[PDB]
């Protein structure tokens, strides 16, 4: 069976993250100041969300719930909480380890289940498994009732020891922690909704149904937009200690939790048919990938606890969960697809990513060109990288129309697509070189002509060499296999040349500029994901679907890298 | 054919106005301050509304439109604009008549078409005539493009002549008026959406569709809530000149415009079937009764032109439009219903109104009791009026279950219902008496025992007299006819006694207190509507459906007057 309507996921990510991007663009532009944003937030959190919760809680058929699925997602969230909690207590300093162990486990476990989770689960499962949408309104509140009072208890313990008590009365610490979690609209409107579920026998009165529809339907768009507004100005410059803790907590949230969810569902929910069980453990995985809840950042800013790591981490967790949800959901869907419709689905993914990536790149390029920054170094060289990324995205669009049409168009469009693709790799190298030569070799002139010649000619030399030395693999749909093993060898050698050049240069540089360094680092990370995926493809001699999985991992960066350069330069507040 | 799903209207009014009531309660409570409210407003007006407009404009099948229906609603709005514009120029003083003639015609014609209009049209017509929903997104923007630059031109003419020019360049006056109307998201996103309708051949791209869904679906609840927030503190104390101009402009908006819309549709759209034409002129009427747009108040508060009358008038127009939409839509639907299902539909209306009215009265009574104000005069006597209205509402709920069941229950529930009903009339009189005796006869003691005896015993005497002197009209379902003509005689005589007492006393009083005086006036207005409806029922000797129309008009005030007491005392910021 299809298990997930996976083709509905990209439009649903573009809905949810495009509304988050609208809120961000609005707050950055000061269309809505931070003072004004609290009105949307108070509407969202105190009117729209509590109505959405009440509606769904009253309607819920509790005898239709897979309780072992709830227990296993809750045991996965509770064990990640316990892991991050115990580790934070053991690793952090005695002066703040209870503020850290309070909120770092809440961060690693409280998903944005209602605003991001629900629309994405509705997109994936409303047709194949409409019952999966019940578990958001169950898991998310029950996870608050378990885990948020434990983190609030740790925060009250910090204040109790900071005020130099040997102990306070423990009942007031546990009582205020519990009372603070009961005061959250999420918890008490779930309690009220569970009560009215029984009082009404699940029939929402016709009078109240449309009132709850109007408030409930308003939550999704307004909460994503409020989330975007709350991201403005939250990525503080962090020390390396704060930055490594942030990477570890975003890892706990977006990698360890979804792996533990998938495992806990497979170990604890053993009472179902293999199709349901596989779909349900796949659902458990993408439940773990939902980003940190803005409620943790709202708590951190109001308590003034760990504000830098938690507000920055909530923003980076939000943004990073979008590609991880996409990549993860497709990886989990791939086992259901036959190799031929799978190949077309991966090309359709690449067309989708390259359409939206090309639009974001055209905006970013226009911004770089109109700001007239494109005449400086490093900006000329970042503008050449964005042009290479734009010819890559347009090339994938043209390829999806040409893919099996005719040999003349295929060869020219492959030359365009792969020369511009190798060019994006070599431009990550050459841009990182120019940052090394600008920061360190100030006296020495940078050869702009030789750099523009190398960034465009060496890719075209590599593509010419490949058309000469390779055999046409015309039995293949995928551009990432149109010249066979020697194309993955050429791709991998180009990635290794670029990661050498860019690693050498950003190292020697450490031995405007912050945006370009950050771009080169994020692109280097992407090139290392592509290199490791391409080397792993080249080393696997035994046949498998693993080939088309690794081609999908490569394609996501090849065509999606326009979003890294849009994120850094399309949204640069300096232009 | 049914023409309107009229039973879906009351839940839709409760959705729309309950979300307006939530926004009001939130702003009054300072859950969302006026500074914070601008964030919800900027989301609503600059993100959610323009996405809703673009979505529906791109989807619209323009060859499916009845252009004569559009022309006639626009000619009805343009003629109300012309009437109010010319009258305001002729009646007002030279120092401000161009500011008044700018915004008073915009007020009298710019409906709240997107936030209140659309969900109410959807509830009435989505099943019977889904094409009727196109015309909100057509009429509202085109009405802005015609009429809003003319009112902006009159405001620029005020500034141009107040700055003592003989005249300015007329092209800059017309050009700034038109440029200001083009800057409205409504106008330019309709232009952009019409263009993309043709560019895309109406197919919203799958990528953009769910993005426009998430923003567009969020507008409905957020705009009603923002409307509620913007109502807080806007009913300024007005002079009589301002108050009469406000009554006249609310009359132009909510009575003259829907009458002219209905007439213009019948005179100008002659090319259709009788069933279509009747439903389309009924739709034209309910289009005109939508309240004033919050965009006129937003303009007035930013320009500082006519703020008192426009912002107060927009709030009162909002509140007054709900009962007018309900009464009008049912009056227009009554010609489609056979007398027996019509009778049951009218009693179901009465049950609906009395359920929600009883809940609002239980809140208002609890507020008066817990504030302990109920021990003062006039508050004891307003509390007795609220108890009478609560027994009227409970009595209608009990009656709808008992209505044709058994004689014993019918006679007791009729005694309870009609004695408490006559008691609400006599308590409007006795309350207005106690205001006269408090303001004027300060030295004289008010006989609280005799007043409570008269307010409950005289109604029970009247009900006893009616059970003695009349005959059981057991062939009738309606409580308002269960004891025949002598019940409407008793009801009308009780109304005439109450309206005498209350008119005499509020007059002699003019020869806390302002809330109670206002309650007596609003209830006196409704008792006069009931008296005139009951006298008109008693005078009509020729048979007709007019009887059950007039019984519906009586019943709406009988069971809905609990909302006047909720509006004054349930929402009193002093408690
Ligand atoms: C590429 C495929 C696999 C999935 C689709 C990914 C999108 C959902 C991504 C691509 C670009 C991303 C955006 C690019 C840039 C930004 C700015 C970014 O700003 C900050 O982090 C700075 C916060 C501050 O101002 O302090 C917030 C995330 C956001 C909106 C990103 C949200 C997620 C987006 C839309
Ligand atoms: C190849 C595809 C899968 C890429 C999809 C985009 C993502 C990799 C997301 C996740 C993390 C995001 C980044 C997280 C943080 C930032 C910092 C932000 O810059 C600042 O906060 C600096 C200060 C300021 O701009 O005010 C600019 C966007 C950027 C790079 C984001 C852009 C979009 C990124 C790269
Ligand atoms: C019963 C049938 C005929 C239909 C009407 C039912 C509701 C839709 C009505 C009944 C009570 C009304 C509410 C009663 C009281 C108020 C407070 C009122 O407050 C103000 O006018 C004061 C503004 C200020 O603070 O200055 C605003 C309208 C509102 C929400 C009203 C909106 C329309 C409501 C919900
Ligand atoms: C009769 C039934 C079927 C419908 C019930 C609701 C309506 C009659 C509406 C139309 C006019 C509305 C009133 C218009 C003006 C006011 C004054 C307003 O005064 C204040 O807000 C100013 C003082 C303050 O409280 O700060 C309070 C709400 C009230 C009574 C409104 C309550 C709801 C009313 C009565």
Curated annotation (Swiss-Prot), chains A, B:
Q: Which loops or segments lie on the Lumenal side of the membrane, by the record?
A: 68-71, 122-134, 202-210, 262-282, 335-348, 403-405, 469-487, 540-549
Q: What is the effect of changing residue 112 to A?
A: Reduces binding to indole-3-acetic acid
Q: Name one GO cellular component term.
A: lysosomal membrane
Cite the GO molecular-function annotations of the record: cholesterol binding
Which intervals lie on the Cytoplasmic side per UniProt?
27-46, 93-100, 156-180, 232-240, 304-313, 370-381, 427-447
* UniProt region (GPCR), positions on chain: 347-575
Q: Principal localization?
A: membrane
Keyword Membrane (UniProt): yes
Q: Where is this region: PIN-like transporter?
A: 1-337
User: TM segments?
Assistant: 6-26, 47-67, 72-92, 101-121, 135-155, 181-201, 211-231, 241-261, 283-303, 314-334, 349-369, 382-402, 406-426, 448-468, 488-508, 519-539, 550-570
The record describes its membrane topology as: Multi-pass membrane protein
Residues binding cholesterol, per UniProt: 10, 24, 233-235, 515
Sugar attachment sites: 276, 348
GO BP, sorted A to Z: cellular response to amino acid starvation; cellular response to cholesterol; cognition; intracellular signal transduction; negative regulation of BMP signaling pathway; positive regulation of TORC1 signaling; transmembrane transport
Q: Which UniProt keywords apply?
A: Glycoprotein, Lipid-binding, Lysosome, Membrane, Transmembrane, Transmembrane helix
Localization in the cell: Lysosome membrane
Domain of life according to the entry? Eukaryota
**What result follows from mutating residue 15 to Q?**
Does not affect cholesterol-binding
> What's this protein's function?
Cholesterol-binding protein that acts as a regulator of mTORC1 signaling pathway. Acts as a sensor of cholesterol to signal cholesterol sufficiency to mTORC1: in presence of cholesterol, binds cholesterol, leading to disruption of the interaction between the GATOR1 and KICSTOR complexes and promotion of mTORC1 signaling. Upon cholesterol starvation, GPR155/LYCHOS is unable to perturb the association between GATOR1 and KICSTOR, leading to mTORC1 signaling inhibition. Binds indole-3-acetic acid and may play a role in tryptophan metabolism.
**How is this protein organized at the quaternary level?**
Homodimer; via the transporter region and DEP domain. Interacts with the GATOR1 complex and prevents interaction between GATOR1 and KICSTOR; this interaction is disrupted upon cholesterol starvation.
Question: Any notes on this protein's domains?
Answer: Cholesterol binds at the interface between the PIN-like transporter region and the GPCR domain; these two regions likely coordinate to sense cholesterol and regulate mTORC1 activation.
Q: What is this protein called?
A: Lysosomal cholesterol signaling protein
Q: Which organism is it from?
A: Homo sapiens (Human)
Question: Which gene name does the record give?
Answer: GPR155
Q: Which residues of the full protein are shown?
A: 34 to 717 of 870
